[PDB]
Amino acid sequence: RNDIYVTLVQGDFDKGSKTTAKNVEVTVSVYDEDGKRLEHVIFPGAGDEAISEYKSVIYYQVKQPRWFETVKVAIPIEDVNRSHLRFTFRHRSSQDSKDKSEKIFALAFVKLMRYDGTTLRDGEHDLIVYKAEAKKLEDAATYLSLPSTKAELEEKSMQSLGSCTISKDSFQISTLVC
Secondary structure, eight states: OEEEEEEEEEEEOOOSSSSSOOOEEEEEEEEETTSOBOOSOEEOTTOOSOBSOEEOOOOTTOSSOOOOEEEEEEEOTTSSTTEEEEEEEEEOOOOSSOOOOOOOOEEEEEESBOTTSOBOOSEEEEEEEEEOOHHHHTOHHHHTTSOOBHHHHHTOOOOEETTEEEEEEEEEEEEEEO
16 A cells, blocks of 8 residues: 655635634545545544544634644555545634534645656645635546646646636645655
8 A cells, every 4th residue: 555644734714705714624535536535545643543534623713724734645556546635625613503504615636646657746735725616616527637736837826727716825735655
């Protein structure tokens, strides 16, 4: 198998008509080219139990969250070239009072394999934070065809692409393969 340590480093968000920060939650998942999720390949903490979905710490009204959370992704070498990491961002109110159906507002992703048959480069990645309607946001067929990192976007300021809004929000991760 293969071990890929994925670190949620930090992000920078805003809201607009809400002159008050969001309580951003990041959900990490491993998906394949067809938009189907890979099950039980995420190993947080001690790494004794695998999950398919990981949720970060929510930093209440913090415009620039610094998660610095590391999870271990372990996927068979046979499934590495068809997989990618998907990061979903959501706002939670954590009120004992139900009011907002807090849904996904943004998404970021990174492919494990390059078009060079070479796995993902170790180090930090400045992911592009894309926004669009809920459902359209989760279409691997869509975003998989768009720039993954800002280093990639520049090798082509863009505020929209393929109908996807390229947010001013920022998100950074760090990867390490083994």
